[PDB]
Each structure stands twice: as C-alpha cells, then as structure tokens.
Design a protein around this ligand. Structure first.
Ligand code: BEF
Ligand code: BEF
Lengths: 190, 192
RNA sequence: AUCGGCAAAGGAGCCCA
RNA sequence: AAUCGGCAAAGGAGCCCA
C-alpha cells in the first residue's frame, strides 16, 4: 500500500478527520495536524513531511502565507491546498509560492489519493534538481577558490603549480578537510 | 477572467473532449489542438508545444501513459495532467513516475479542474527553469578548463601573478563584451 | 598490537576506543 | 557631462547603441 508522510491542516476538525480517515486507509503516515498557520509552521519544522494539505481560510495566518514560509524555509517537500476559495487572486498566489496541486472543497475523495501521489513524487524530483544545482554551483565555487589559492601560494613561495597543488593536497589530507576549505583560508590570508 | 495558457485535450470519448473544451475556453485558455489516441497526442505536441496536456489513460493505439512518457522525456509539452476513471494503484505509479503534475478522476469535478491547471502550468515552467539552470552551470564548469589554459598563457607571457592574469582576462572580456570562454579560445589559439 | 572515520584519488595522509 | 536599452562580468562595476 501507499507510502508517504503527510501533515493535515484545516481549522474545521470535521474536515481534518475526514482526510485523516481517507489517508490512513490508503496507508500513508499522518505525522501531524494543525488548526492555524503557526501550528502548521512549527509542526512542519519539527516533522519535515513529504506533503502538507492545507486550507487557505484559517485564523492567525492563511495557508497562503504559512505555505510561503514553509516552502521558503523548505520545511516540507510538497504542498497542496484545498479550499472552497478558487478565485484567481488565490489561485495565482498559490501557484507563485509553489503549490503542486490545488483542490476545491467539497473535496473529491476519489481524486485525492492520486493527486497525493503526484504531488509527493514531483516534490521529490524538484528537491533532487535543487540538490544538483546546489552541488554543481558548489563545485564551481570550489574551483575558483582553488585557483586563487594556487595563485597566491605560488606568489608567496615562488614555486610551480604542481607543487602548489601538492601543498593543498597534503594539507587537506593531513588536516582531514576539503581542499576547498583550506583554499578559502589561504585566500582570506592575503 | 482572462486566464493565459496553451492546452491540448486528449480523450477517446468526444463528448468529454467537448465538455472540457468548453470549460477551458470559458476560463480563457487557448486550446491549440486535440487528439483521440496516443499517436496523435505525440504528433500534436510536436507541432503545438503546449503548456499543458490533459489525457485519459485508456486510449486506443497508445495508452495515455505511453504517450505521456514520450511527451515528457522529449519535452514536447511543459506539463501533463491525467484524467481517467482508472485510479488503479499501478496506473498512479506509472503516471507519477513518468512525470505527471496532476491526476484527476472521472467523472470530473469541474470546480477543481481550473486550479489544478494553473498549478500544473506553473510547476511545468519552474521545472524547465531548473533544468535550464543545470545545463548552464554544467556548461560553464566545462568552460573553466579552457579559461585555465588562457590564464596560464597570460601569466607566462606578461610575467605576472594569477590574480593579475585573471583580472586582466576579466577586464578584457568585459571591455570587448564577450564570453570569457570565447576570449580564452582566442588567446589559447593565439599562442599556438 | 588491531578495528572505525575524514581527506585525497592530479591519491595513498590524518584522527579515534 | 547625463539617461533608455543591450553585451559581459558577478574571481563584478566594464563596454556598445538613441
Ligand atoms: F476554512 Be476552509 F476554506 F474551509
Ligand atoms: F475513459 Be477513460 F479511461 F477515463
């Protein structure tokens, strides 16, 4: 049966429990619940769920603004709204902040589980791309700092690039630290 | 009022294609084509390059899942949303794996369609931005090896520091307003 | 005297019970 | 001497067009 970790957010517990039944029957893990945007933020912060289901109209903080915080900080992998509100203002706001689905009340208990599976998977793949972008842009920070470190080290010692790389390689290995970090220190040095 | 987006509709029951067509046009979208089987679905996407594809699973010739895989992996459309009576667990696994952005179930809840369209269009665009940023970084990381040769040539020929040689190459490439890789190619062939 | 980890792999160093 | 746009940098503040 289905696999995924889910957080449920609505101010009306009646709807919150309808969802809770459907989702657990399908076999997901319901890890937390919230009745307002602040409980929702703190629950996600602790939880790190795969999906957050939430209503726009809540007390304290509408799901739009709480969702904005959730996605900005990356407290959850994917987020899907459901509300009886579907005016274009709320639709644009939800799509801009980065929702992966939006369902209109009263919810289609038939569509829900499929849209859950889609939103979880596309959430994961989006997190993979962000990690690949992070990894590449880091490696491209590293080579710049490394090349600066080669240059400054050659200027101070008056030696060749092979010896400069050998110095960085021996230091990083001896000191159990990335050549990139050693280079950042040496470049800050001058 | 006045939604923007370009859509293609794909189902074997023409009554449902017309019900959908009427809804999306009333919202303000542009329908740019329709199909009634997987083979026309791929061909229409090749021509139109739409923002969103709406398709049933059970279609003749090529099930919507097979056309959906092709459309996604060749990027013939920026986002894709299924709409079927089939909610079968195997069908949801296939649809999410190939790369759907939504999976509504027949008979459709018309209220829900337009929001899921807007979300799926935006998520499709954003996913293509991220893929473009990956292509740009990985290219610029390959340019580095040519730039590192051009740097080495400057430090020898001028008899200067690495930080001075890069500062020269950068100020040159900005002055001549050309990609450092292009200036690096010119220098490295000039030494040859 | 032995196990484990980080770094390097343009390698073969370092730390811990 | 200034502003609009564009190219390139971003290991940054540089260059072209009205
Ligand atoms: F508060 Be939800 F919009 F029912
Ligand atoms: F008729 Be399709 F399978 F929804």
């Amino acid at each position: 049966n289905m696999d995924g970790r889910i957080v449920i957010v609505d101010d009306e517990p009646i709807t919150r429990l309808d969802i809770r039944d459907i989702v657990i029957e399908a076999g997901y893990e319901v890890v937390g619940e919230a009745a307002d945007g602040f409980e929702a933020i703190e629950v996600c912060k602790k939880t790190q769920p795969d999906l957050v289901l939430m209503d726009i109209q809540m007390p304290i903080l509408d799901g739009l603004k709480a969702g904005k915080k959730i996605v900005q900080d990356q407290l959850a992998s994917s987020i899907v709204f459901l509300s009886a509100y579907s005016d274009v203002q709320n639709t644009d706001k939800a799509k801009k902040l980065g929702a992966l689905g939006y369902l209109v009340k009263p919810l289609d208990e038939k569509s829900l589980i499929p849209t859950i599976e889609m939103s979880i998977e596309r959430g994961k793949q989006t997190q993979l791309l962000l990690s690949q972008i992070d990894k590449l842009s880091l490696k491209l920070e590293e080579r710049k700092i490394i090349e600066k470190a080669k240059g400054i080290l050659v200027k101070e010692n008056h030696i060749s690039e092979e010896e400069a790389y050998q110095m960085l390689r021996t230091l990083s290995m001896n000191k159990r630290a990335r050549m990139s970090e050693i280079a950042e220190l040496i470049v800050m040095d001058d």
